[PDB]
Amino acid sequence: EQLFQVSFVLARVLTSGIIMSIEKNENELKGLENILKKTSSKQYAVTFNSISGAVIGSLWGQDIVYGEATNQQSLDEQQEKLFKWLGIGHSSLLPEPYTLHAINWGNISNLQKITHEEAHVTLLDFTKLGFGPCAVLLTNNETIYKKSERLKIFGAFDLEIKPGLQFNFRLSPLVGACIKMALIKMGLN
Amino acid sequence: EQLFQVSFVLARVLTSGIIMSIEKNENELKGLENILKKTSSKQYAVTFNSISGAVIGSLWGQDIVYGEATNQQSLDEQQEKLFKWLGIGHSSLLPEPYTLHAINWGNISNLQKITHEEAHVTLLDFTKLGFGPCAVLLTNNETIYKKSERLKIFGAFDLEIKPGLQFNFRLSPLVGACIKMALIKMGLN
Amino acid sequence: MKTDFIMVPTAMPDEKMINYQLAIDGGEPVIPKANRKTIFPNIAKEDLFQMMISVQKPEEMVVSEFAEKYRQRVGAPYAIPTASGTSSLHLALVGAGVKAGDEVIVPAFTFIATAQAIVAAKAIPVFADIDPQTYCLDPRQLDKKVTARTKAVMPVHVHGLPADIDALASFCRQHQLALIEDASHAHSATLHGRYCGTFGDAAGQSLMADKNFPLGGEAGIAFFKERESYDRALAFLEESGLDYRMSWVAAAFGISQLDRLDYYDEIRQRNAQRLIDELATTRLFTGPMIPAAAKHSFNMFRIKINTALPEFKDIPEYKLKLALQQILNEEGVFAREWQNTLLPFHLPFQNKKGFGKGYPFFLGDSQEYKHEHFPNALQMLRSTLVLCRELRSPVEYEKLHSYIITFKKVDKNIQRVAEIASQIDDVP
Amino acid sequence: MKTDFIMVPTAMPDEKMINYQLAIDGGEPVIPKANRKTIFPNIAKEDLFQMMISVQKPEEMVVSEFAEKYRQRVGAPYAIPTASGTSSLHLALVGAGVKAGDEVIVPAFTFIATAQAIVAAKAIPVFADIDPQTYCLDPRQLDKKVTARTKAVMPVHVHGLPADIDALASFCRQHQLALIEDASHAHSATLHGRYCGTFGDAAGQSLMADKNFPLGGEAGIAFFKERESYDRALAFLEESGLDYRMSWVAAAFGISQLDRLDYYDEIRQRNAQRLIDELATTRLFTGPMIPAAAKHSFNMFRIKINTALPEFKDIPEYKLKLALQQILNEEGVFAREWQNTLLPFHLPFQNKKGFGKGYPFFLGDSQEYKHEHFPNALQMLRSTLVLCRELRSPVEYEKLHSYIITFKKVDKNIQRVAEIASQIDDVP
Ligand SMILES: Cc1ncc(COP(=O)(O)O)c(CN)c1O
Ligand SMILES: Cc1ncc(COP(=O)(O)O)c(CN)c1O
């Protein structure tokens, strides 16, 4: 039943002809965001094509840049390296930058309990759903949101916040639609 | 699971662009036939887009035409009417014209046991598979086969057996491919 | 992946190829070998996606959905979906009140299935000649064919050209006959801005994959004017015990195809009209004649040969046709025949076996048909070529222009056409 | 069903529309409103079916399958699939041995992502001017860029036109520098019959859905000449902890698209070449210049305006450009700008923030760029317009001819172009 549902959504979006992130009338990523915002009760959502993009967004969004430090007690080997590459140090005395939740087919059904938390920045890694690398950042912090978008090339340049280095962490609508579908099937509105 | 397998076959054939019965390089109906011939151990197979076509084929194939009679002891109310329309009477003294087997998703797996029998003409009704009306006639009788094809407009006129009235009982390749798939999934190499 | 996708685009042909040597005499063909294929039907992403939609719904709903959708567009009061065009015509005839033994007037030139629908209705086909330009049932001859048995007239909108409804309808009401259309070529064809299939008391229409409006394989539809007819046809299915039901798979393809029909039709119209206009300038060729109120669907494009040109003096018409066929086919335009023989002389109407023992035929005074009865139809078969798939497909400008160059190329070699035709061996 | 399918075919435009009133002054536009949409990418049944194939396989295999397929075609020794073109360029630079602090020569005119790849590699972009005709990195103005820090030269095959590899390769070997191509526009573009992406020690290439060869959304690929480079780039991913992996969904679309790429490319070439030839006859317009050994992919078609015509005497070039943009857009040809400002003067390279505290930039001699440094690039921005989707899409003949009529129509109104341009208000 999964193979059909996946195929159906890919067919629908392909039929629509709207498969670019930056294209007008793209409503798959916005749809994904809205669901996650409603589930988490967060005001702002930013989609990425990589967990790295969500991580960098949360860090740079709180001005945790080259030369700064944060708490890396809850980071895995990969995130440790990413922080080192960004030029960010460790301190046990400082707060954590985010709470990361790796989402998969086991725990996707129970997303309410996971996302309803006091964490001011929630990072969701959807990569293990098998639709391709994807991550979403959730916050009530407007400044984090705005900085997270501006770090993406074509993020809030669809037309205060001056951008430095930028990456292409824009998510494929097709990938976004698959995740949106998966969420809708597994209980979430 | 079923939805995907059905969709996949329809997509494959649609991608091929070969969706006409009478078109060259159409190998879905021949493939269907071969499987059924191997299962039944019969030499000849004729596909129809209706059980009526298989019935008429079996009757006219044995020269049971307007004015003739046969045994109607095992006919359902529908076939009783079809025989009457063809102008064919009843006689308990005569043999039955065919043995009809209604195939569905319950019994498709056990087709060997059903088709391994020693009647002159085996008729398989696949309509209840839900791919559309379809029937296949199976026999070792070459004359039945040839008359069953000649009954169909464009049956072996791709260029002896003089045709009278004719019908379009040609089967849609798309429909044929779906049934072929169903068979392959449920055994019947 | 097995795909029909054409990988080589049709290059824009040089207009200087009109002066080129013919391909039959070792010249460069107007259309290269690689550019000779056409795709039909036009299978798009929409059609694949439509299968994924329809598969989830009850099959009978999918068929109902289609029937209504197409009915509304055509503008027919009532409609029955069926497994084939042949079955639709059968249901159309019976629905319109054709009973066993009745005579039905039909053209001698049409597809076998037209007449086999009449015989399926247990009625006797009365074959008539055609107009030499429209190629449809000739109304002038209809006096000579009427008897006490004659119940209906069954004109064919052959090629896609609407038949002379105005004339045939008057004849029908005058003699209290029913009019049954065969619209199996006339998808989207109109007369006085009304689609073929709405004029007669009933009508049948193939929806096979080789028609301008294609479904997913074999399919058809019957149209009825009044509910009396629709009910009788439904009642026949109950009584007859015939299963003439449509496949959802076939219907699904129709649903998606109908959304894009007008687009394809427009290309089809503009392509055909351009070719007519261009063939009007040629001395050798002439495109199909179209009455003022009529719109041709151009399922088939029949070209008349001027066999009466001086260069073709003592050359029989069939040799000209055969030579032109070989010449054009070498250039890359696959011109051919649709029907080789008239239905009267097809084996079914020679043996007159029917259901058996000649069931339908012995109900009425049999006539022995002869070739001299159908002079117009036989002239057509001798002096016309047909294009079929090459203009049913909504081809691109480069391809249409390639056709125009080909005819204009051949039109400059009327002498060589004559020389080649005269070298062809005789045929009895 | 939600579909992008265009329902109105583009009519063949009348050649007499060259004499028509301009659309900006209440005239009939060359291209009607309904015919102004184009489909890109070309999503066919094959692409939908390919999703149904690929979904059944492990995602990493689908990505591997694609990578190999495309690699073999391009003729690159080694390749890494990635989530974006930006990431490919980053991996290309690092793989070719670009370390933190190194300087990289780049054109001032390109997409931001080119330079943001350099900064991502912790290197410092050294912006250079472009040739005024090719619009690529100018090899003449490259002596004055070299320092002890300079490690690599990164030319952009901008628009799809291969850059002056022969000249830039000589400069690289001379100064022992590495050559890194940005082939994000140059899908299928060749120099001496070799595809862009094989020349440099490494190269990056966007495979986004807005490129001539599109994947299913965001994607890219990095090419490397030697294995030591490929290994270093792989080793960087291990050390950096960056996840630059491609989506199978995106790759799947690439697999099917690649089977039909050559077809689309051919239409793209013939369409562009015809437009060049036709614009050569116009007094006002000129298509892109192409070296003999080069083949343009025509991702973008940049047209030069003759701003030095007598009618445009005391009119600044930007007003001519703006007027022509409004005039053409009213006719139906959506001419536009690709880059509004040069990368030096984009905010990222004004604030020089980088990773933070100006990490990459403070690791070398600070450069205050000014407009006078890039006169050629600025002249281009003032005196050229660009066609993007309208010639990236392999449009039909009727549409291409509509374009040709539009330019020829405007070319007959050089006086009115001047009158409209002079009426535009001044700006910063
Ligand atoms: C006039 C006419 N009637 C009927 C048919 C046959 O219809 P079908 O194959 O759908 O039974 C044809 C040929 N397709 C035809 O040309
Ligand atoms: C020349 C060039 N290079 C790089 C990019 C960015 O590539 P991507 O979006 O695939 O990361 C673009 C814009 N798509 C571009 O035009």
Domains, chain B, with CATH or none? 2-13+31-185 (3.40.640.10)
Cα–Cα distances in Å, from A101 out to A134, D195, D390? 12, 43, 44
Q: Which amino acid is at B98?
A: Y
Residues with CB under 6 A from ligand 2: A 168; D 84-86, 110-111, 113-114, 156, 182, 184-185, 206, 208, 220
Closest-CA distance of chain B to residue C245, Å: 7
**Interatomic CA distance for residues A52 and A82, integer angstroms:** 7
Q: Beta-carbon neighbour count of residue A112 at 10 Å?
A: 13
Domain C15-41+262-339+379-422 has CATH 3.60.20.10: no
Tokens coding A16: 């629509």
Domain ranges of chain D: 15-34+260-296+301-337+379-422, 45-259
Return the structure tokens found at A22.
Answer: 């930056």
Interface contact C259, partner A, CB < 8 A: no
Helix D248-259 and helix A173-185, axial crossing angle in degrees, nearest 10: 130
Give the count of beta carbons closer than 10 Å to the beta carbon of residue C47: 27
Residue of D93, D140, D95, D141 whose CA lies nearest to D119 = D93
* Cα–Cα distance, B10 to C249 (Å, whole number): 9
Q: How far apart are CA B109 and CA B117, in angstroms?
A: 17
Starting at the edge strand that comes first in sequence, how are the strands of the sheet with A121-125 ordered? A44-48, A135-139, A121-125, A99-102
Q: Mind telling me how many Å the CA of C427 is from chain D's nearest CA? A: 45
| Region for D249 from its dihedrals, namely left if φ exceeds 0, alpha if ψ lies in -120 to 50, beta otherwise | alpha
Ligand with minimal distance to C155 CA: 1
Q: How far from each other are the two terminal CA atoms of chain C, in whole angstroms?
A: 49
Question: How far apart (Å, rounded) are the C-alpha atoms in residues C40 and D130?
Answer: 49
Q: Give, rounded to a whole angstrom, the gap between the first and last alpha carbons of chain D.
A: 48
Residues 17-46 of C with CB under 8 A from A: 45-46
Closest CA to C406 of C303, C309, C288: C303
Biggest alpha carbon–alpha carbon distance for chain D? 66
Burial letters D193-216, b for 16+ CB under 10 A, else e: eebbbbbbbbbbbbbbbbbbbbbb
Q: What are phi and psi of A164, to 5 degrees?
A: -100, -115
Kindly give the residue spans of alpha helices, DSSP state H, lying in D260-362.
261-279, 317-331, 348-351
C283 token code pair: 């001395």
According to DSSP, the residues that pair with C295 across neighbouring strands are C190
Which structure tokens are listed for B34? 């071969």
Q: Which residue has the tokens 């006086």?
A: D415
Confirm if D157 and D182 have CB atoms less than 8 A apart. yes
Q: Which of C133, C153, C244, C136 is nearest to C199 (CA)?
A: C153
**Residues paired with D341 in a beta bridge:** none
First and final CA of chain B: distance in angstroms?
20
Instruction: Report how far residue C118's alpha carbon sits from residue C114's, in angstroms, rounded to the nearest whole number.
Output: 7
D369 CA → ligand 2 middle, Å = 24
Interface test with D, best of A32, A49, A161 (most D CBs within 10 A): A49
Q: Which of D249, D343, D361, D393 would you mutate first to test chain A, the one with the most A CBs within 10 A?
A: D249
Tell me the two tokens of residue B96: 């039955």
Q: List Cβ neighbours of D185 (8 Å cut-off, separation of 6 or more).
A: D156, D157, D158, D159, D160, D206, D211, D212, D297, D299, D300
Inter-axis angle of helices C248-259 and C59-74, nearest 10 = 40
Q: Is D244:D219 a contact under the CB 8 Å cutoff?
A: no
Q: Which two tokens stand for residue D254?
A: 């690439």
Look at C250 and B132 and tell me if their CB atoms are within 8 Å. yes
Strands D384-387 and D78-82: unpaired
| Tokens linked to D128 | 């250079």
User: Domain spanning D15-34+260-296+301-337+379-422 has what CATH number?
Assistant: 3.90.1150
C27 closest CA partner among C423, C409, C363 = C409
Beta bridge partners of A138: A45, A122
Q: How far is ligand 1, taken at its centre, from the CA of residue C40, in Å?
A: 17
The 3-state DSSP composition of chain B as helix, strand, coil percent (nearest 5) reads: 45, 15, 45
Q: Do D5 and C396 touch (CB under 8 A)?
A: no
Task: Count other C-beta atoms under 10 Å from residue D250's C-beta.
Answer: 30
Taking an 8 Å cut-off on Cβ atoms, the answer to whether B162 and C219 are in contact is no
Distance separating alpha carbons of residues D232 and D99, to the nearest angstrom = 11
Helix (H) or strand (E) holding C107: strand C103-107
Which token pair is B91? 């006689």
Cα separation, D168 vs B117, in Å, equals: 81
Which residue in this structure is represented by tokens 């596909």?
B47
> Three-class SS of residue B179?
helix
Region of D154 (left: φ > 0; alpha: ψ -120 to 50; beta: rest) is beta
Tokens, residue D111: 């997409």
Q: A181 Cβ partners below 8 Å, 6+ apart? A: A5, A6, A9
C-alpha–C-alpha distance, residues D250 and D51, integer Å? 10
First and final C-alpha spacing in chain A: 20
Instruction: Classify residue D228 by burial, with Cβ atoms within 10 Å: 0-12, 13-18, 19+.
Output: middle
Residue reference for tokens 């986004």: D208
Cα–Cα dist C88/C99, whole Å: 16
Q: Which of D52, D55, D393 is the mutation pick for testing A, counting most A CBs within 10 A?
A: D55
Here the tokens at position B109 are: 């797996």
Documented resolution in Å: 2.8
Question: Residue C275 Cα, ligand 1 centroid: separation in angstroms?
Answer: 26
Within 6 Å (CB) of ligand 1, which residues are found?
A: B 168; C 84-86, 110-111, 113-114, 156, 182, 184-185, 206, 208, 220
- Surface of B (10-69) touching D: CB under 8 A: 11-12, 14-15
* Chain-centre distance for alpha carbon D143: 26
Distance from CA of C272 to the nearest CA of D (A): 14
CATH number of D45-259: 3.40.640.10
In chain A, the residue whose alpha carbon lies closest to the alpha carbon of D2 is A16
The tokens of D197 are what?
């992406």
Chain B, nearest residue to D256 by Cα: B15
A 10 A CB-CB count for C372 gives: 7
- State the Cα–Cα distance between residues C182 and C169, nearest whole angstrom: 14
Phi, psi of C319 (to 5 degrees): -70, -35
